[PDB]
């Protein structure tokens, strides 16, 4: 037992000749065994039975510039006694390390000259490390790389021994994950969002689909059924979206797997052509409808910022989205107005207004348009604002300050008109009462209809802003002055120097209050007249309400005004542009019918005879580095029309 | 003042008008149909009764409104008090929508214009 | 190193990693892992929290002199430590004494706001009950309770600052005074009105408004609004 | 900073039952003197890998043995 143990800190030390004497001692110890199972002897004594470590991986948690030789000398010895595949390719059978191999660990302590080593020795680079470090609370003990020990050699910045691993014919990069992932999946969910963070994960995405891989690379779906691309889109990963969704490739024989095609080169005017497969709302899942449609990402408007996006957005807003928005504003606006003319009453007078709207069986034709016309929309709003709050489980009002929101107050609106009626045949005695808070909220709903001019769109989203992140600050601080100093003033009124009985006729601390209200408004009560007691105390209690408001509203402006030349100038922009991409993708879901009139380019040549292949996009470019060219696919045309 | 009027007091207006119209209905049904007193002296309109009293409060009346009043009439402060509020962020807003970049743009912008 | 306020060097002194073998017993920090970019890591803490008499994170919150002390607490083996003791005891234990002075200074409210509206001459500040209103047998009681509990509390601080008492105006230490003036005039409401030298309601008023005025100390824990709120 | 001072307010508050503080439970230092100094876990990321002879333990995760 003893043996064991002194053999394992000789090797994490680096005992050169004390090893040999043990593995000497142990060919003393081989011979003591008749001719049985010397194999399953070893496999006892090289390896602790708990853990399943054997004196290979102690041998590679720590290193000295002993190791070499150590390496060198143990391999050996389990060549002198033919095991070594097994011995290579041991792992742990605890279950929080299910399948860390030597290999794996090599890797990672970053020794390519013993990487070589084990791979003359024939491991297995196709394992699998399924342990217990995935850790869904990812914030601590995880490093999910994707099990393998190419994408470890690829995620931590090895590009030698990728360059070596993927030499290996037995090496493997179509295998998969207990996530469904593949290499190319694991890359995604490492790149941090800090820009150049001495970046490589743009640079080795680059070296492994340019080394080698054909198409059957990002076809390929999880557990969750993505691309790397959807992946990449639903994680928010800015920059590493950049390289896989420009991707130009100036070479002859592999450019069918670019993403990006130069169509001229005159110079410094060029005109490109961007793939766009996965990429426009026309397949399920696309991955403009996972940009829009999520949550739990803060680059977002970094996100729509990249170019065959950005102009994608532009296009459907030029072509179908402002049309399709001027017009349900201005359907909206007649509804809002038509509602407004029953209080506006153009009779001005009338028995009894003995209904909130009503068809008049007599005459007024133009009460018979309107009276329905309320009542068509009301239906409308109710079959169609029902289905986004029936869609829409988890992104309700988590970011308060989004979209999501008003589809419940375009919801309530038309509740309330149909309860109206609802409430009219029943005679419940709330006839209007239930009708005019429908029709404030009728015009409180206007405000999801101020985007689509820039200069007021910007303006109408820091309107959301204070009222629920500055107001209640402020207001909850003036609510507390309010009910302090009304104290002072309500023991003057009521049990002390006023003059003779009053006229309350709602309370006595209610009446200071009430009394203190009006002060930011403007009463100049006679109160001051209703006094005794040095009633210029009155005045000076009263103005020292005043200055200590003013303070309170000056606070608030310092406060909003918190680096605010830059923040919420960018910050609106952020908001509004991405309420804008709502809007037009729910225009685009709206009528699935006729869309003859998208945009597609008309799949001009990939690189073969299948020259009919992909729906394009054309985007121009301009000066700054001029040079030779010859990666363009027609002979420096214009606007051909052959 | 070229610019303020006729690139940012028509977002404000248009806004101001929005909650303008929009608060004007819930006080002029109960300016009508409902709390007040007896009878009362209108001479151009009922809807147009409460806006227009709604208009001063801009600038000041503190009406009698009050006191011609009933079903809780501290409900019709609340509801006026809530209007103030609600116009004083948006005179906010217009300030710090004018505050964009303010430091260095218009100081240039004017500059650039006037000469 | 903690009282002097010296930034600098009290990064050097707190974070020390050894990556020798001979002589790392002497260092501060200790990596635990090392799995490429992911790592966690130790750190010493042997006179640091607040387990014995005169700890340097007593040491930093209780002093004036520095300048530089926001940057005292922005280092990692500090910052975090507040933060957990936040999460665990500090959360808890406000918002509780939030709440029980919140109800302390609305029972005091609601003698003013007056729920009968009408007797005789309101002949008290506050009185018990001999006959009926177990509700205001309850309330009564409850003002005078916590009236006793903060000048037993609150006078300890006046008791133990020597230095440090309004020097940083805009500071603390100087609400443990106002809060303690809103104490001393309830009892000294009731003492007056055993005595009856007719200023019974007119000291009353004014601890009911401090009362208000005091609810600004409370107004931490909400980043948001404790920024507004120091202003 | 007024944070700081209402947190430690509240930890001379009650020193009755502090079973409910942060130690990490004094792991090992150096010598064979393992149960030395209570500690504190913090965790750090990415930008200059390099090879490590520093740890402590082999590896291992959130350890129960």
Redesign the interface.
């Known amino acids: 037992k003893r043996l064991k143990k002194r053999i394992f800190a000789a090797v994490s030390e680096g005992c050169v000749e004390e090893l040999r004497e043990l593995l000497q001692d142990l060919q003393d110890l081989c011979r003591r065994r008749r001719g049985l199972d010397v194999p399953d002897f070893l496999m006892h004594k090289l390896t602790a039975s708990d853990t399943g470590?054997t004196c290979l991986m102690?041998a590679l948690?720590?290193?000295?510039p002993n190791t070499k030789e150590i390496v060198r000398i143990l391999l050996a010895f389990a060549e002198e006694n033919d095991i070594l595949d097994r011995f290579i390719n041991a792992e742990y059978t605890e279950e929080?390390y299910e399948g860390q191999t030597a290999l794996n660990?090599a890797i990672?302590?970053?020794?390519g000259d013993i990487t070589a080593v084990l791979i003359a020795a024939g491991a297995d680079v196709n394992a699998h490390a399924k342990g217990?470090?995935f850790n869904p609370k990812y914030?601590?003990?995880?490093?999910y790389f994707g099990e393998t020990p190419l994408a470890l050699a690829a995620?931590?910045?090895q590009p030698e021994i990728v360059q070596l691993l993927m030499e290996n014919e037995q090496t493997d990069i179509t295998s998969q994950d207990s996530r469904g992932n593949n290499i190319l999946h694991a890359l995604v969910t490492v790149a941090?969002d800090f820009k150049t963070?001495?970046d490589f994960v743009k640079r080795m995405y680059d070296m492994i689909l340019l080394r080698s891989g054909n198409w059957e690379l990002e076809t390929m779906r999880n557990n969750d059924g993505l691309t790397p691309l959807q992946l990449a889109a639903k994680m928010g990963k800015a920059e590493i979206l950049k390289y896989i969704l420009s991707r130009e490739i100036k070479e002859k024989p592999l450019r069918s797997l670019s993403r990006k095609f130069t169509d001229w080169a005159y110079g410094p005017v060029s005109s490109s052509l961007y793939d766009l497969t996965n990429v426009d709302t026309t397949t399920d899942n696309s991955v403009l409808e996972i940009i829009v449609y999520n949550t739990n990402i803060d680059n977002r408007h970094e996100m729509l910022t990249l170019e065959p996006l950005h102009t994608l957005l532009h296009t459907k807003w030029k072509k179908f989205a402002k049309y399709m928005f001027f017009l349900s504003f201005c359907f909206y606006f007649f509804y809002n107005i038509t509602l407004?003319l029953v209080?506006?009453?153009r009779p001005?007078e009338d028995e009894d207004?003995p209904h909130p709207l009503a068809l008049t069986h007599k005459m007024s034709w133009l009460q018979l348009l309107g009276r329905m016309f309320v009542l068509i929309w009301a239906t409308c709003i109710s079959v169609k604002e029902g289905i986004a709050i029936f869609l829409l489980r988890p992104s309700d009002l988590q970011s308060i300050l989004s979209d999501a929101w008003f589809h419940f107050v375009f919801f309530v609106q038309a509740v309330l008109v149909i309860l109206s009626v609802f409430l009219y045949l029943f005679a419940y005695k709330e006839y209007?009462a239930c009708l005019?808070?429908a029709?404030?909220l009728g015009?409180?709903n206007?405000?999801y209809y101020?985007r689509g001019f820039q200069?007021?769109g910007?303006?109408?989203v820091?309107?959301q802003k204070?009222?629920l992140?500055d107001?209640l600050?402020?207001?909850?601080?003036y609510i507390?002055?309010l009910?302090?100093?009304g104290?002072?003033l309500?023991?003057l009124i009521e049990?002390?120097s006023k003059d003779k009985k009053d006229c309350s006729s709602?309370?006595?601390?209610?009446d200071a209050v009430?009394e203190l209200?009006?002060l930011?408004?403007?009463?100049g009560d006679l109160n001051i007249q209703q006094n005794s007691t040095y009633p210029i105390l009155f005045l000076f209690l009263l103005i020292t309400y005043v200055i200590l408001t003013f303070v309170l509203l000056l606070?608030?402006?310092?406060?909003?005004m918190g680096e605010?030349?830059?923040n919420?100038?960018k910050e609106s922009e952020r908001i509004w542009r991405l309420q804008r991409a709502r809007t037009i993708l729910e225009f685009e879901k709206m009528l699935p019918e006729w869309l003859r009139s998208r945009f597609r380019m008309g799949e001009l040549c990939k690189v073969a005879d299948e020259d009919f292949r992909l729906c394009l996009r054309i985007n121009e470019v301009k000066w700054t580095e001029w040079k030779t060219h010859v990666s363009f696919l027609n002979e420096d045309p214009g606007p051909i029309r052959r």
């Open positions: 470590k102690k948690l720590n290193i000295n929080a660990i990672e302590r970053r020794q217990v470090f914030q601590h003990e995880g490093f995620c931590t910045n941090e963070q001495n407004t209080s506006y009453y001005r207004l209007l005019v808070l029709m404030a015009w409180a206007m405000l101020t200069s007021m910007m303006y109408s820091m309107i204070v009222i992140h107001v600050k402020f207001l909850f601080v507390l002055f009910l302090g100093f104290v002072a309500a023991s049990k002390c709602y309370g006595s601390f209610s009430l209200f009006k930011t408004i403007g009463l606070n608030m402006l310092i406060a909003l605010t030349v830059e919420v100038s």
